[PDB]
């Protein structure tokens, strides 16, 4: 009865076979079969070491003309007996490795015994579940679909806490392909029940779009569900869902209202001291609103931006620049929210009339303006105490309510990870941003670890939740860069931060000292100088006005001229880099900032060029001094208003000034900056990653909301497709292999040439 | 009264299996297993 010799054969065939695992991992399998085929030298092998061999091996060969050679060499093996419950996983992968090819018409029966076995394999209805799905490719069988969602929910209901957010993406999807009968919704309903509400917390925005839409009342039962176990996750975006449909109806009972209001009720008895305090707070952060100083100053800040753009595009025409209606309808709003001595003083001025035909004379006017109202703003309080003005907040403790810190129900983890309310500190701070001066009050834990977060007041919710739907898309493919070994070398991820919507005027943001942004630097550094700070943008308008004047067309060369002139006076090439030197006095620290500056920039270039992001304004982009970490404020698709192409025609690929190029090394923009791109142009290319029912679902609800906007077909299937297929098209582009070595190159050479940045917008700032 | 919060199905047994490992280790009188259900 030797049991020690067997142990030593089973733990060295265990450590042979994991070997030969990670070498297949690695992404190669010619060595992984050499190592594989060692096992052959042993006379005795166990029965079960010798399964995982050839599971391993056929994996190799599915990964690797040579699909004869992979499919004779199942066929040599499994001769007489094996046991019922490996006799299930490796008649899925058969029947997976014929379904790769053209022979489809014997492979059903395949599937159907890999799946007769024991009914609790989540690979076994997977495959079946994605074999399903080819078809639906053509010949699209309106009654059969029903069948694809019913595998999906029976292969959600054993996988847990990993790979279950893509199977959830394909159901959504499948969901908008319905016909007038409602046979889909009633299979979704029918076959869901059982599965945990955990997997539902990373869809709540796209579960709310279809119950919002038309015959979908039958989804109200996954709503509750969720609500019945966490109410907190579910409550705040039903309020403001709520709001947004009460504001936009009142401009012009409501269905959708009703259904929220129903939503509302039950969950009214489950938990009422928590929604009770959850009321509180929100009624009580109606204090935090700023005066009407900073309001003013705020959208002033709003017009003159507006004002550039409308200036960008009179490039080339006459003088004259005709004032647009759109700015004509904002001057005379500003008329009307200001029109006790100085609240008239406009009116006479300079606003009586909006312009009879002059554009320059109007922003070289509201310069002044701003410098008036910021210089007379500058006595403003900062501080205020809890104590006075609202006293449910200042008397609030652990013992009234189970409440949880704003944001802790965004992503699902395994662990529990729920840190609770202990006391709102009675200090909170005004700081100035770049366009108002929000309120960041502090937050502690029962940990005792203190949290600080920004009160926000942005308007314009049209223009607000598609900025939140990025950022989602961006939190879900975070996971995605970990499961591969050459991004978790350079330690890549998005950073992204926690953004919860309470109001759809006010919601709270997570926000961190020390966070200042690109054009912060300029000022300070510009301040420490004789000059202002809009002497370059005034510059470039004023004497390309004069070069025009004597009746000449603008060509390139005289870009390319004033361009240089702007470099050589007012902003150096390392203005960067002496702000960094003395910033940091380590040398240590310097490196880790510099490296860390890397990293983050090429996933954000990465992200702004290949999905079709927002333009990367200087203000947009903010630094982290603490950490070095690297985060840009609110992101927002590009999608075009006649019709959703979805095309960015910008002349560079991203944002490659010449003050970053040389601020971390003529090296560093080569070797590190295209490295962290290519590694992850390898990770999502992966066909083993999902990741077009991902993009599909977030691109479903982004078409919908622009055509809610904007004036429930297949054309919006197309069109969604069809931008798809754009964003592989461009993917697969910058990924590929070849003799040479890759395309990423060639972009980022013309990035940083003064060709392609003398054509750009002087508000985008190339030479800053 | 006390009670334990348990997550999904999956989470059960790792704490039923550490558990059961914990309380095997450093007892070494008893050798047995023996559980039952009731609905």
Redesign the interface.
Known sequence: SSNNAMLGVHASASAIIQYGKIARKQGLVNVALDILSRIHTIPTVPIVDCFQKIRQQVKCYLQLNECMQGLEVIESTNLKYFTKEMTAEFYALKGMFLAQINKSEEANKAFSAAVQMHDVLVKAWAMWGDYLENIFVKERQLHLGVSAITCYLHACRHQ??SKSRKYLAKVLWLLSFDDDKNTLADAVDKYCIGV?P?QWLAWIPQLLTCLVGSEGKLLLNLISQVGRVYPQAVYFPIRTLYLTLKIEQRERATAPMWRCSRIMHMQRELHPTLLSSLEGIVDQMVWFRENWHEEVLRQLQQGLAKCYSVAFEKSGAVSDAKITPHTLNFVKKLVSTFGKLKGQFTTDFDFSVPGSMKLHNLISKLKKWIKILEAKTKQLPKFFLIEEKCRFLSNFSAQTAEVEIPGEFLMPK?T?YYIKIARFMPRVEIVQKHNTAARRLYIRGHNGKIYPYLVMNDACLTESRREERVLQLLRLLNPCLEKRKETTKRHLFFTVPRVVAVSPQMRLVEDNPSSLSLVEIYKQRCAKKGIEHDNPISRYYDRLATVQARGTQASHQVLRDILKEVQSNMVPRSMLKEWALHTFPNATDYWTFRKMFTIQLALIGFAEFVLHLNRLNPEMLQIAQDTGKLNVAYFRFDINDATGDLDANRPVPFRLTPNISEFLTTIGVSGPLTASMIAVARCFAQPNFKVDGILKTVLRDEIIAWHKKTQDSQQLVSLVQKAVTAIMTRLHNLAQFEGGESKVNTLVAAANSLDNLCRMDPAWHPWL | SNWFIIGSKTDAERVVNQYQELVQNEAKCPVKMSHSSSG
């Open positions: 847990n806490e945990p955990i395994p529990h």
